[PDB]
Design the sequence.
């Protein structure tokens, strides 16, 4: 009765519409084991939230800074706090955060307390959905937003891969790729840039250098699946 | 069902006249599976209806202009006035996605006959689908159905089967001599002994490749020989 | 009743249809013992398991070559990587025997004792190396998606899809060597030659394949 990924079809037996965003799409059988479904239900939400923050990261950076290109912007920021002091903070400050999230996955009733401010405590929530501090002023129904998080999330995970594969083919940001498509739609598609006939394979070259210098030792910058491109 | 494809032939047991155009045929056993007979019925309707557009394309594109040749009408130099030297990669991008919608909706009408009838965007008017392969409703803007439907359902195939053979004729009367169907009709009706099936079977007027904007094509005739 | 390798002929008595990819093909009756056939079911998988890794490995490094990348061909990838990276060759192969001869005798005592290797004798891991059946260990490490449990009706389908891709991967890795010894070039160079002119650029026109050239 629920909407599906393909309306004439039937959902598989392990998908019964219990979970948010459950449109019945799992052709490869991956939601069969219920031990491993919890791991994937967590990892879809984590993959979505980083990608929502990344796509809105590139879109905000492109509308305020037309100078630098985001694929190259991990190289040119010139922080005064060192190249590896940043990585040292990010390593420790995420090896705290993720392991708290991981222990919440393993035992859900084990991570609720502020360890250094024990007067404060998280509410006994659902796994992957902390709330309490992480969720003030929730608008409307919570399960409505729980589907809005994944629909915008799944749209953004396809968006970031669309950002990367446009950044390796035309090498410009995703409004500059949009301005290439809106100035000339009939010639600026991937079907226009490439075709494989049985007898020759015409693929675009990289708009990406093979390596970069970056302060001494060189860093390899490969085009993600160059050679297997159409 | 009767008046079969040959006089003394017993019709097969699965061809008792239910489907239209049923002539006790299939001397290759392909409709013996009941689940395969429906799909071969759907693929017969597709091969009929595209050929009826194909025949009505080829002998109309040379009545409106007997200049652009239908074998090389796909080359961008031969496209009309707003489309001359279009990017074929862009036009294939339209056609692929516009057809991967339509066909998969038709394909799911095969796989689940009944859960694909509604306009999915506008939950409004449905399509009343009486039987598989015959959607109707908005595919009948003239209301020419809802009469003796079985009579027109036979007329669709008999015109369709002839159009399949005529369109494979339209190709083989074009690779053998490099000439259009009404143009090979003129070539026959001028000298009906030097422009027959003889002395043109065994010569292929098609090159090994015609380059399209940086792409080669294998371009094979349906028999060897040049 | 089931489809057999050769229609008409019945399957042999030792080969009822329960294995994956079973098509009754034992003309030499090599699986006539029910315990050596337990070994050859292990043997067909790990030959197909390495060949599926192999045939994907030849093809993916040959897709990168002939497009313009700096890839070697699969018969020349052995020399070019113990020369670019200064990797001493005997100390590469010996560690290959250490790591895999570890991983192989675990299998060789799964076949001798299927309940074994699950006593905490390893670093504490007990039921990860339990082993579900012959040639299909499963558990946490070897099936991290968890596809061998949940629905078992689709798992029997995946068992057959593994063996089917596993058979023709072994035929491919028998054909990559055969396309190289006959012609003397890479695999997708032989494919693109067969797609240039499908006539006359086949196996019949070498003079290496048929001696009646
Ligand atoms: C549009 C996407 C979207 C939506 C609908 C939701 C919805 C929800 N989230 Mg979620 N979340 C998202 C993105 C989203 N999230 C992202 C990207 C992250 C990573 C930062 C998180 C991290 C997160 C956590 C850690 C938790 C939730 C929780 C919740 C639930 C209650 C909170 C709430 O009312 O949020 C409503 C959300 C909105 C109204 C979206 C407003 C967006 C505005 C327009 C700003 C966006 C643009 C701006 C540039 C973004 C940058 C902000 C910042 C980085 C500078 C609800 C299901 C809580 C939960 O489920 O516990 C019960 C919870 O604990 N989410
Ligand atoms: C691709 C086109 C196509 C397809 C799918 C079908 C399918 C079908 N036809 Mg049909 N038919 C066709 C074209 C086609 N027809 C043409 C062109 C004619 C005119 C000669 C006929 C005349 C005809 C009659 C008279 C009857 C059928 C019947 C049937 C049904 C049962 C036969 C069966 O199971 O075969 C399934 C068929 C296929 C899977 C097609 C396979 C094609 C093979 C592999 C190779 C083709 C041979 C060769 C290349 C043809 C070249 C001809 C040349 C002149 C161009 C089935 C639904 C019977 C019926 O109505 O039952 C309901 C029946 O009585 N057909
Ligand atoms: C001359 C061949 C011919 C014939 C006799 C029919 C006959 C029929 N078609 Mg069909 N059809 C044809 C060609 C034909 N079609 C082609 C070429 C296509 C591809 C565009 C279609 C696509 C098609 C669809 C998608 C549907 C029909 C439907 C119908 C049925 C009712 C409509 C009608 O009478 O139209 C007859 C019209 C003419 C004879 C005009 C021909 C004049 C020329 C320009 C009837 C069985 C409908 C149906 O059965 O609904 C339940 C339906 O859904 N047909
Ligand atoms: C089934 C019998 C048969 C076979 C196997 C061939 C075989 C061939 N014919 Mg042929 N032919 C045949 C009957 C046959 N023909 C008949 C009955 C006529 C009339 C022709 C008229 C004909 C012409 C006009 C030509 C061929 C040619 C050819 C060759 C390439 C096509 C090939 C050797 C061609 C060739 O290369 O000589 C060519 O130009 N044939
Ligand atoms: C790599 C080795 C290998 C091994 C051990 C097996 C093992 C098995 N296969 Mg199998 N198979 C293989 C490769 C292999 N297969 C390949 C490549 C194909 C595709 C052609 C098949 C296709 C196949 C089918 C279709 C069927 C089996 C079946 C079987 C089972 C019973 C037959 C038996 O006792 O095998 C004994 C096998 C050996 C002793 C190893 C073969 C080595 C021989 C002795 C060397 C010579 C082989 C050949 C002539 C040389 C070619 C290369 C040469 C030119 C260099 C058994 C589990 C049957 C079964 O029950 O399915 C599960 C069955 O129906 N196999
Ligand atoms: C079944 C696996 C297998 C196969 C078919 C081959 C086959 C081959 N190897 Mg190879 N090799 C293998 C395993 C294998 N080796 C292993 C396990 C190692 C050690 C890590 C090597 C290390 C190796 C080197 C160092 C070289 C080869 C070379 C060759 C080629 C000899 C001509 C031939 C294609 C030589 C080559 O490149 O051919 C010219 C070569 O120089 N191989
Ligand atoms: C996995 C299947 C496979 C595929 C897709 C190809 C594809 C190709 N091969 Mg190749 N080849 C294969 C397996 C395969 N090969 C094997 C197993 C051998 C060893 C016998 C060879 C030996 C070989 C040579 C010597 C040459 C090619 C060539 C070619 C190319 C041109 C086609 C041709 O000449 O036909 C060759 C086709 C075959 C040899 C047969 C196809 C595979 C059959 C079906 C074997 C399967 C085993 C069978 C079912 C059971 C064996 C029975 C036994 C157990 C008792 C083409 C790209 C030629 C080339 O380089 O082109 C320029 C060429 O010179 N191949
Ligand atoms: C120092 C370098 C040498 C040390 C070598 C490693 C020794 C480690 C070792 O002793 O293991 C420590 C123990 C050793 O094993 C323990 O030995 C005991 C005495 O024999 C008893 O046998 C216990 O049953 C057995 O667990 O190993 C573990 O139990 C590992 C458990 C891992 C649990 C992971 C949970 C998986 C779920 C998360 C996945 C999501
Ligand atoms: C679909 C079709 C053609 C559609 C063509 C189209 C849209 C063409 C469009 C164009 O041309 C125009 C308009 C303009 C051009 O500038 C551009 C193109 C694009 C080129 C032909 C099918 C044509 C299909 C044909 C001819 C199929 C024939 C099959 C037969 C006869 C088989 C019969 C049997 O298999 C059975 C049925 C049962 C067995 O028991 C017995 C045997 C005998 C085996
Ligand atoms: C063909 C084959 C086996 C064929 C056996 C057959 C037909 C036996 C059939 C029978 O027994 C039965 C069934 C039943 C009996 O009654 C009858 C017979 C008839 C006796 C195995 C191939 C098996 C082929 C295998 C396992 C190949 C693996 C290849 C690998 C790992 C390659 C790796 C590399 O290529 C890369 C990836 C990169 C390179 O640069 C480096 C290297 C290392 C070269
Ligand atoms: C949690 C919480 C809680 C509390 O309570 C409150 C608060 C605070 C409010 C909250 C928060 C929230 C948030 C932050 C959110 C965010 C979101 C996002 C970011 C989304 C995105 C999302 C995103 C998305 C969808 C995206 C999409 C995108 C897209 C399609 C794109 C496309 C493209 C591409 C490819 C490329 C080309 O060239 C162009 C374009 C066209 C450009």
Sequence:
């Amino acid at each position: 009765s629920r909407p599906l990924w393909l309306p004439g079809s039937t959902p598989p037996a392990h998908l019964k519409g219990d979970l948010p965003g459950d449109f019945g799409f799992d052709p490869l059988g991956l939601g069969a084991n219920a031990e491993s479904l919890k791991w994937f239900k967590e990892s879809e939400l984590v993959h979505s939230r980083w990608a929502m923050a990344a796509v809105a990261g590139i879109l905000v950076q492109e509308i305020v800074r037309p100078d630098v290109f985001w694929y190259n912007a991990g190289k040119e920021v010139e922080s005064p706090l060192g190249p590896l002091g940043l990585l040292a903070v990010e390593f420790f400050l995420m090896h705290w955060v993720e392991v708290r999230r991981w222990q919440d996955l393993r035992k859900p009733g084990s991570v609720d307390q502020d360890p250094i401010f024990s007067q404060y405590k998280l509410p006994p929530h659902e796994v992957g959905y902390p709330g309490g501090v992480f969720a003030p002023f929730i608008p409307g129904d919570l399960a409505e937003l729980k589907v809005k998080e994944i629909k915008n999330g799944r749209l953004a995970m396809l968006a970031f891969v669309g950002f990367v594969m446009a950044a390796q083919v035309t090498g410009k940001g995703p409004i500059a790729a949009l301005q290439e498509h809106l100035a000339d739609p009939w010639g600026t598609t991937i079907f226009s840039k490439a075709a494989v006939v049985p007898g020759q394979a015409v693929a675009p070259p990289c708009k990406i250098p093979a390596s970069v210098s970056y302060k001494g030792i060189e860093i390899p910058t490969p085009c993600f699946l160059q050679g297997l491109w159409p | 069902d009767r008046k079969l494809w040959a006089p003394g032939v017993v019709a097969p047991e699965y061809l008792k006249g239910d489907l239209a155009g049923d002539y006790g045929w299939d001397p290759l056993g392909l409709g013996a599976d009941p689940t395969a007979l429906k799909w071969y019925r759907q693929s017969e309707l597709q091969h009929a209806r595209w050929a009826m557009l194909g025949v009505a394309g080829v002998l109309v594109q040379e009545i409106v202009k007997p200049d652009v040749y239908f074998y090389e009408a796909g080359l961008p130099q031969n496209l009309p006035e707003p489309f001359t030297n279009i990017n074929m990669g862009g036009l294939l991008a339209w056609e692929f996605i516009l057809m991967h919608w339509v066909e998969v909706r038709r394909w799911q009408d095969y796989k689940n006959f009944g859960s694909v009838n509604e306009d999915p965007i506008f939950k409004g008017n449905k399509v009343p689908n009486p039987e598989m392969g015959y959607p109707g409703g908005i595919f009948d803007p003239f209301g020419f159905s809802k009469g003796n439907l079985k009579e027109l359902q036979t007329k669709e195939i008999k015109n369709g089967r002839l159009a399949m053979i005529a369109y494979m004729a339209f190709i083989l009367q074009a690779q053998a001599t490099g000439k259009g169907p009404l143009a090979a009709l003129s070539a026959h009706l001028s000298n009906p002994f030097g422009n027959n099936i003889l002395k043109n079977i065994g010569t292929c007027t098609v090159p090994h490749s015609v380059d399209v904007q940086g792409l080669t094509i294998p371009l094979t005739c349906l028999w060897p020989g040049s | 009743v089931r489809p057999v390798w050769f229609p008409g002929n019945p399957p042999p008595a030792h080969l009822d249809g329960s294995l994956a990819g079973d098509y009754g093909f034992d003309p030499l009756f090599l699986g006539q013992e029910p315990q050596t056939l337990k070994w050859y079911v292990q043997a067909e998988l790990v030959h197909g398991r390495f060949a599926m890794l192999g045939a994907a490995g030849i093809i993916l490094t040959s897709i990168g070559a002939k497009v313009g990348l700096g890839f070697p061909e699969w018969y020349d990838a052995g020399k070019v990587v113990v020369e670019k990276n200064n990797i001493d060759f005997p100390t590469l192969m010996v560690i290959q025997f250490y790591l895999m001869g570890w991983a192989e005798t675990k299998r060789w005592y799964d076949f001798k004792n299927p309940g074994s290797q699950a006593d905490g004798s390893f670093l504490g891991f007990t039921e990860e190396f339990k082993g579900l059946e012959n040639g299909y260990p499963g558990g946490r490490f070897f099936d991290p998606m968890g596809l061998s449990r949940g629905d078992a009706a689709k798992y029997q389908e995946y068992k057959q899809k593994e063996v089917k891709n596993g058979r023709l991967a072994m035929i491919a890795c028998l054909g990559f060597a055969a396309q190289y010894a006959a012609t003397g070039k890479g695999p997708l160079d032989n494919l693109a030659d067969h797609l240039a002119d499908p006539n006359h650029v086949n196996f019949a026109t070498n003079g290496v394949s048929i001696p009646i050239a």
Q: What stands out?
A: Helices of chain B lie at 34-64, 88-111, 149-175, 181-190.
